Copies of this chain bind each other. A is one copy, B any other.
């Protein structure tokens, strides 16, 4: 396989379905990436992640650079070997979590110091991990932001995008075997989104993320921004909506041209008791499930729904049992992959608009 090749097999409106070929495997798009925090997709063996249909996972860099450390992971053979996942991994840059999870941060044009992470160091860490898709290092913009502050932040992020590109290209093994994505910023402002898209396309990347939209703005506003933002990106490269989202967010984002997604919702909310079903989410802790012998979802093909009842999982989650988290997480990740499969198939068959309508009618009934 090549280092990177994105091919679009079918289209419907702004929606696309296809494949990304990389050295470590093929990624079917639109794709959902389960999130690995601290070199594990929480409560799942990697074989179980694969059994749900995932082609690629996201690794959070911020935690790994702290524990066990990027140089240590490299010494041990890289993240793939360390965690037992041999397919593609996309790594975030670490910049978002440095701001949310650190203390005593100090920002500057060089990077961020916290209790330093620069564009150059972020790319090097992602190299040491052995990432297949490397994210440029950027300054995520708070929401809401004034136009002046959104512009300042976006401009710095574009300067940082060039530094990330040059750092990646300087390292032969990384440039030859991995891919690099740039991140569009600009908050909710069309002119800033356009300037950011233009800057990123001038530098040139293997794929383009829409950054800064998993920030509490609400679905209507997210969709309004995607409406004008996604068409600004190069059509022939993947479009990655970072940090999104709920099932209906994913469907609407695909309708607007997004090809890749990641979120902690299926894993984190699974451990909390929320299960996704075609008839909407349920909270398995609710007393109404204590004697319900049906599986989490009537149609789901996952290994949990073939074997275990709502009543049993209700008991496990109420009791704080590890198996409860295991079963909820496997089901939820499987549900997300089944959603992506239905999206891909419906685009291929030219019936995605109908699928989205049917999906919403039943999910929100």
Contacts from A to B (Cβ < 8 Å): 38-40, 42-45, 67-68, 72, 75-77, 82-84, 290-291, 293, 307-309, 311-312, 315-316, 318-319, 321-323, 325-326
Contacts and interface: CB of A to CB of B under 8 A. Distances in A.
Please state the number of chain copies in the assembly. 2
Given A72-B291, A318-B67, A326-B322, A311 B42 contact: no
Contact of A323 (B44, B72, B293, B323): B44
24 contacts: A38-B315, A38-B319, A38-B321, A39-B312, A40-B321, A40-B322, A40-B323, A42-B322, A45-B323, A67-B318, A67-B319, A68-B290, A68-B311, A72-B291, A75-B291, A76-B291, A76-B293, A76-B309, A77-B293, A82-B309, A82-B311, A84-B307, A322-B325, A326-B326
A308 B44 CA distance: 14
A75 B292 CA distance: 11
Contacts of A76: 291, 293, 309, 311
Nearest to A39: B315
Contact of A82 (B43, B67, B312): B312
Contacts of A290: 68, 72
Majority DSSP secondary structure for residues of A touching B: loop
A43 B291 contact: no
A42 B319 CA distance: 11
Contacts of A312: 39, 82-84
Given A45-B323, A322-B325, A40 B72 contact: no
A72 B319 CA distance: 16
Contacts of A308: 84
Contacts of A315: 38-39, 67-68
A237 B75 CA distance: 56
Contacts of A311: 68, 76, 82
Contacts of A82: 309, 311-312
Contact of A43 (B44, B68, B83, B323): B323
A15 to B, nearest CB: 35
A180 to B, nearest CB: 27
Contacts of A43: 322-323, 326
